[PDB]
């Protein structure tokens, strides 16, 4: 949880910045304003709540399989 | 899990893949039925294959359990319809929707791994006599899938 | 000269400008540029079958407006 905690995170802002990723592939729901997003070293983003649970049992990015601890 | 499963169902309706359909059998969202069309120009061409899908309570943090109910001849799929495929076990990712899973399974049909077989006898034929493999696979397709 | 569509792993569809003579490796490279997934983790599917590196789009009879599906590298066992 510590390691996971240290991975970069930020709250989504639809207006300020348009990102190529608009949705969380874990819950299959859109990113919405103020939600906490977690960004893995491969630069793929997810809802923190969603990918944090995945990272508890797995070390890899859901999208590219990249090691998240690297 | 339930909200995600409904999301899967919506994805399928809006943007269906050409060789696959799936959905809840009953009103139970955790038990689905699926169909895969045998790919063209293969021993499975013309075939229609039915499958069953059971989502675990922790989906999608764990893979769906997927099995053929239509008999099929293949090194990686046994007489019980069990499919031995890595994305269904340790290589699972939540990015894989049931649609992407069924497509993956469809693609396994013509891309078997005879070197790590579920059914050794079938793998042996595949490696030693390919025409014989293709002939039997077509026979099973004609008998069971048509 | 032609366009094809790729259903990606990120929950959307992208359009690529390609040619019949383009290799599958070349297409995977473009996908990596857009989606940030390395080619070795990419498995492209068209008409129910995997597309193999070393072949071209024309080898698979992939015509204009075709839809390819991107899934993750897999192996039977
Ligand atoms: Cl839920
Ligand atoms: Cl079994
Ligand atoms: Cl495995
Ligand atoms: Zn999410
Ligand atoms: Zn990634």
Q: How far is C50 from chain A, CA to nearest CA, in Å? A: 18
Q: Where are the domains of chain C?
A: 1-77
Contacts of B15 in chain A (CB under 8 A): none
C-alpha gyration radius of chain A: 11
Q: Residue A25 Cα, ligand 1 centroid: separation in angstroms?
A: 15
Contacts of A28 in chain B (CB under 8 A): 4, 7-8, 11, 97
E strands of chain B, at which residues?
A: 20-24, 31-37, 48-54, 65-68
Look up residue B27 and give its DSSP letter: S
E strands of B14-95, at which residues?
A: 20-24, 31-37, 48-54, 65-68
Q: Which residues of C2-23 are buried (b: 16+ CB within 10 A; e: fewer)?
A: eebebbbbbbeebebebeeebb
C14 touches chain B (CB under 8 A): no
Contacts of A46 in chain C (CB under 8 A): none
**What experimental approach yielded this model?**
X-ray
Distance of alpha carbon B103 from alpha carbon B20, whole angstroms:
7
Q: Residue A64 Cα, ligand 5 centroid: separation in angstroms?
A: 4
Residue-level length of chain A: 70
Q: Where do the H-state alpha helices sit in chain B?
A: 2-14, 98-109, 120-128, 130-144
Distance of alpha carbon C73 from alpha carbon C57, whole angstroms:
19
Is residue C71 within 8 A of residue B104, CB to CB? The reply is: yes
Is residue B51 within 8 A of residue B83, CB to CB? The reply is: no
Domains of chain A: 1-70 (3.30.40.10)
A21 touches chain C (CB under 8 A): yes
C43 touches chain B (CB under 8 A): yes
Distance of alpha carbon C54 from alpha carbon B84, whole angstroms:
27
Look up residue B142 and give its DSSP letter: H
Token look-up 């059914």 returns B119
Q: Are residues C36 and A28, on separate chains, in Cβ contact within 8 Å?
A: no
Question: In terms of residue numbers, what domain contains B46?
Answer: 1-146
Looking at all shown ligands, the one closest to residue A29's CA atom is 4
Return the CATH number at B66.
3.10.110.10
A65 touches chain C (CB under 8 A): yes
């Amino acid at each position: 949880k510590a390691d996971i905690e240290q991975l970069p995170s930020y709250r989504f802002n639809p207006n300020n910045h348009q990102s190529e990723q608009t949705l969380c592939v874990v819950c299959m729901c859109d990113f919405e304003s103020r939600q906490l997003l977690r960004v893995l070293p491969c630069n793929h983003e997810f809802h923190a709540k969603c990918v944090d649970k995945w990272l508890k049992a797995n070390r890899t990015c859901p999208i590219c399989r990249a090691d998240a601890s690297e | 899990a339930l909200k995600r499963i409904h999301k899967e169902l919506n994805d399928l309706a809006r943007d269906p893949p050409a060789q696959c359909r799936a959905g809840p059998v009953g009103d139970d969202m955790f038990h689905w039925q699926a169909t895969i069309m045998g790919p063209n120009d293969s021993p499975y061409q013309g075939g229609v294959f039915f499958l069953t899908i059971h989502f675990p309570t922790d989906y999608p943090f764990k893979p769906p359990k997927v099995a053929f109910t239509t008999r099929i001849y293949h090194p990686n799929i046994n007489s019980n319809g069990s499919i031995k495929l890595d994305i269904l076990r340790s290589q699972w990712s939540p990015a894989l929707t049931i649609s992407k899973v069924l497509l993956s399974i469809c693609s396994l049909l013509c891309d078997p791994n005879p070197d790590d077989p579920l059914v050794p006898e079938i793998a042996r034929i595949y490696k030693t006599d390919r025409e014989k493999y293709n002939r039997i696979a077509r026979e099973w397709t004609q008998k069971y899938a048509m | 000269s032609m366009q094809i569509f790729v259903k990606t792993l990120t929950g959307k569809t992208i359009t690529l400008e390609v040619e019949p003579s383009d290799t599958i490796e070349n297409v995977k490279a473009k996908i990596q540029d857009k989606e940030g997934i390395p080619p070795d983790q990419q498995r492209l599917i068209f008409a129910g079958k995997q597309l193999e590196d070393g072949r071209t789009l024309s080898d698979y009879n992939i015509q204009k407006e075709s839809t390819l599906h991107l899934v993750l590298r897999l192996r039977g066992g």
